[model samples]
Target: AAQTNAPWGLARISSTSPGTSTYYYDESAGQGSCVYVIDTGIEASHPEFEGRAQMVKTYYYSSRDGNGHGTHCAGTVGSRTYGVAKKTQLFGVKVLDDNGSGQYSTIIAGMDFVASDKNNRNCPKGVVASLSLGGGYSSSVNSAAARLQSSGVMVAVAAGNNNADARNYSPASEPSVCTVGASDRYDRRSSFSNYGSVLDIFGPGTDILSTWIGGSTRSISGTSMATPHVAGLAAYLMTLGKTTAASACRYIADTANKGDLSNIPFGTVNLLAYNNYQA
Candidate 1:
């Protein structure tokens, strides 16, 4: 399918820059940082992600790729040159597996895995969790995400790509989850990105070039792609002691570019200004 219409010209930025240069330059370097990618699992061998994925603590609840969605999402979040936190540690938690289907129970299991061993002397401490999957809102899922937050874990979720007035699915809709909406380079909401008061922030998510399952490359669109930008940003912010999910979210919103989305009543939140908060 053709890339969805991005409200603020995010697609154009991908063509202009090979990677997330502007986004990263705006924040401090994420050296010696580690982030947990709780999604379908990443292709560790991809050139963009070679030797960059830390799988020691990975948990695959579902079978191998049921579909390629997880790999694509993983690539967007940590695929070396394509990812915002290109050099940061990525612990792949394959809750959805290759088929791109997993029960909420399995998702919680993945979150549990991260929370349980996050502070193990052998493992890195104070990691952030980037979740790019969710159905509608669920009390159970929200509770689980909140627990993760209470444990001092930063959680970032993808606001649904449904383009609806209602907030996106569970985890994303949860107040504790840092719900991320998709915006173009111009900082306008992607036409398909779900928006509501629950929407926390926006990021580049149109025609984004990222790695595929077998070392291939493709341009995809969705709030799925945008969520990682914030996740990566969270990792960078963590280096500066902005470790909690709420603090990271506040930094993102405060830095957003704040574009005009008069076409949609719910409108869009500009997050590019986050790149200039300290400037």
Candidate 2:
């Protein structure tokens, strides 16, 4: 059978690919849910977002995106064409600058914004904060993320591209955060993807095609890209009433496709993100 020309990232999560472009997902996926892109700014005018992407706040100097990391991650999470949760609202919380780098203080500021937004009843009931940027261990960062997760916001973080244990990373190591690793279409862990027990799940990140800083789409690779796929999944589950971070984390793990990936490293869970779409 001819496939639907879906992105491999979407296909892998829905079901084992027939080596084709087919992707199956829930009809109500991501409805009534919102995802915050906590990285570089997103290009809100991008067509893939379908008017759902909003640039809410920016800790960076410029509101524009010279770095495409955040936009790409947002696309994976909720873009109309490339997203896992197509109906989810997307909020761009710009913390990283044009170089895709930011201080721990800037990250905390972004987290504070989300917490305030949630407290003010500005967000939907099902909220997720997608963190595709991270660095080495920082107690400040971990603490900030813990508060965010506790405040009824599901937090998803990248496991890092260092090929080291994710425990060495800041928010990725945070117990309340759902850390994601990168995987290829063949179910092999990306060579540069961080591993170990800190990682909660793996998602397609290699050569992932998504919205870029410009109006166009681009294919990139990294655990940074993998994180939002899981974030989108968390949002998808939220629409189903998985509101708490702990509940979303458990649902993601329990529903994930297990024993499918290779070279997952010792202590890392060998599970791939799944969207509960059965083919």
Candidate 3:
């Protein structure tokens, strides 16, 4: 299958040019990697996961997701049907509430748990963490994410939806975390996506379609959606020998498809995340 029929965001990342006619990917496709989703929660039983997605920890009471955001992000990270790394293992570390919001303490707790998990710290192929949530600057959250990265987890976070400087945000401003901004099908920076030097890369975020609460899917827009694409790419790269947080992130940036995006701000990098699977 060409996977040209996949979601446009998926197709866009695989192609070097500014079009979505196909999505080429490695055959292993993140088979030996793990991706942790730190957000509202996840619907682990969604058929899109094919039994690979699991909720290992949660600050919220239930392991199930009442809010759809986490599930959507997870699907983009590594679902059987709508994923970037289709065979990657997925662990849900719920930190946000049913209302899709959380305190710095709750968020940090989840990051701390991921850092403490032996599986994440010891994964030989490396681990990737997708954080689609953010807020104003908080040293606590920033440090927690830094600690997680030091544990060898490649962390990807949303810059923000404020359309302002990403440095004004918490985890996005954290130097150790890979900050992601949003772009559209035409290779233009999303109007609502936060920008600035803090942003490390951009990914397809506008009208992104992925798994929702049930067995269904939804199309939404935000830096939240874009972060997972990078996270998934990091996981994919891990299986290809980028075995640490720093190495995986460096590979993504170094191999990025550059210079085609438009409407980028002065301090932002015009690098778009690529799956490195040209066919």
Candidate 4:
């Protein structure tokens, strides 16, 4: 596969040294928090994860690990040292099968599980959720997502990787959910990241290196990778007792290092600049 022009060094730096994880340790530690990753199932045995992660529930809508997309997405969000909230619990809902294909109904069912999984004690009070898949905007999807939000869950979604003015599909387009775009080393929007007023925030997503299946390492790109960064950050924020999703989003938006606002469209979000918001 051809690599995009997005920067990789800064992404690596953010993943390795005192980046998101460091921020959590310093600011939030993630003592009693959990995040639901509604994507493909992760390679639970990866060393970067090992005992650090647990599968709250797994849904095989199709088959398992069809195209490795889910595993890749999982690695980006909660892969050991590279993860933003490494200490926070993770729940993987395999809405997409090994072939990297699934229907809206399957995804909706996954959302329903998260919204009403009272049986799972590990499900935190104010759980943070991540969604890296999209199939265009739908009022039905938005309504379902709104229901989840009303239930006290913060959802972070990918703002599509199409590199077009048109927003990505489904939950990202929903106003109630926090949509995330991708940025490179220079903190510019990734060339492939979708832009529009709907995007709520941006994070490191281009050429991000993280855990891979079968104990390996590789770099990948997409808003999918970016969504988890925010999701993990949200978990950390929750651990710091930042209960409200708005406050957590505010902190990340306010604290993000501002650079080129021109590449993104008008109404595009910028992390707010605040000293106490530092990670």
Candidate 5:
């Protein structure tokens, strides 16, 4: 896995200060859905949040954003103006340290927390879980993601920034989850995006802008930026009654704009675009 959802400048379906190719998904902005931005922690007080992204947790069990990575991902996933789902109850789960990196165990521990509700069991129903980080393959992380999926959580992850086979990475290599590869403004795969059979879809990751720490906005890159497009869309679909993870995945794969993967050996991956929100 590599990235998270783009709400602000990971801006997929709306007008923002910055722009990119195929960035406008022309989709339904989801209302009344639950979304989790699992990366670095969020600022929680960002104005764009409007207090909707209320749940905040960290691997350390404290509220802090060592880096703004988690907040940026959250902006793209659930920000009031930047997100695809306009009314999602956002949850920020911090797994990384101050430098935007973390241990594999810490990452899995965060997901496990979501899988079983670590904080007084305050979890909600049929959540959309988004991860925007990647590293060495881990069987443990894979198992945790699968459990979330089976438990009705829609999962989306980045393919990775190394441009290698995503199957070599944990969580991205995991099954029953949407493995997102990054796309650029030209509707092509970003040069740094990992490819192979493991990718479930591709999205605009190049020069994407989104919310940053200290209540500002910034432009960023990485397969990480491309992933949340899928996650946010999945949350929107959930509001349309695609309650289960499998059904949400199916609705996306079936209805998304299908196209060829840039410079890949596969036929095609689903493009994050369409006029319909319901089957």
Candidate 6:
């Protein structure tokens, strides 16, 4: 398979990238799932997206990537050039403004709008929230996640990039989220990643190259980067009817890869695995 369509994180977890002998299932790539990327924003016309990205003018501003973070994460979650589930439909929910930031209230609003969106008759499986931003903790935001979950949608959030305890953060600490942390290419914990029991899983984040704001690509580091890999996998789970949101999350956390992650107290979250679930 050509690496041109697959993201490195997806390649690491599945046979979707270049450098492998397995048959890549482009047909099974998030066939019925839709991914909602709640971040800075997205380049709706990015070629990698092929015009599949639906932009909702969210709480903060127009759904356009000024800082490029959202576009990168969106590609990683689902795109042609850098994606885990390349065929998945994309929803760009602008939580953060062009200045590259957002409030907890606005982020929650984005979640609510995406999760409750009734116009998406095309999404047969369900919607999955890909949250790559978090700052302050609030019961209000936590309630938003619960609302999404109650509506049969699961939210995946970044643990944070501070290399500190993640439990003190907002959505990461919130019980409703599938909180994610960053790992290096070799499966070692990314040095800048936040760690704690609150963290749910690991995804490749170090030097991750993905679609940028200008239709190019760039590499960056953060727990935010790790989040999309899991978000993609979670959306795949929905399409496949694997389990409910909570159960799918539990299955990922407990039945992970052969363990041995370093530098974190929570420790050894697997690189995303599709093989185990295939059975």
- The best candidate by TM-score is 3
lDDT of 5: 0.71
Candidate 6's residue-wise lDDT over 92-121, tens digit each?
888898888777777878877877683554
Which regions of candidate 4 fall more than 4 Å away from where they truly are?
A: 1-28, 59-66, 123-125, 166-168, 259-262, 272-279
Q: What would the per-residue lDDT of candidate 3 be over residues 1-279, giving only the tens digit for each residue?
A: 356578888888888887656678887788878899999888998999999888989875687899999999999999987899998988998899899988899898899888878464435677888999989998888999999988878999999999899888899999888999999999999989999988889999999999999788999999999999999899888887755677777778888998889999886899999866655
Q: Give stretches of model 6 more than 4 Å off.
A: 1-7, 15-26, 118-121, 266-279
Candidate achieving higher lDDT, 2 or 5: 2
When summed lDDT is taken over every stretch of 10 residues in candidate 1, the lowest stretch is 1-10
- TM-score-best of 2 and 3: 3
Q: What TM-score should be assigned to candidate 5?
A: 0.84
CA lDDT for candidate 6: 0.75
lDDT of each: 0.64, 0.85, 0.88, 0.66, 0.71, 0.75
Model 6 shows how many backbone clashes?
0
lDDT by residue for model 2 (1-279), tens: 113788888888878542657777777778878899988899999889989888888865678778888899999998877888898988888899888788999899899889878654444647899999889999989999999988888888999999898888888899878888999988899999999987888889898999896699999999988999999888887776654555898788888888889987777899988877654
Give the better candidate number (1 or 2) by lDDT.
Answer: 2
Candidate 4, residue 84: the lDDT equals: 55
Q: List the residue pairs that clash in candidate 6.
A: none
Against the hidden true structure, what lDDT does model 2 obtain? 0.85
Task: Order the candidate numbers by lDDT, best to worst.
Answer: 3, 2, 6, 5, 4, 1
Better of 3 and 4 by TM-score: 3
**True-vs-predicted CA distance for residue 209, candidate 2, Å:** 0.4
lDDT of 2 at 213: 69
lDDT of 5 by residue, 1-279 (tens): 112344333433332222433234424456656788898888888898888775456767566876888887787777765666666778878888878888888887788777666334333435788899978888888888888777767889888999788889978898688888886655567889888777777766777777788888888888888887778778776666654567776677666565543565454464654325222
Better of 1 and 5 by TM-score: 5
Cα lDDT tens digits for candidate 4, 1-279? 111221242233233221232222333445467777777766666787756555556566432444555566666555555665556666667787766666888888888888887346464535787888887778788788878777778888888888864354777788778888887655567889887888777777877777776777778888887787777777767776655655566666665555443367666765411123434
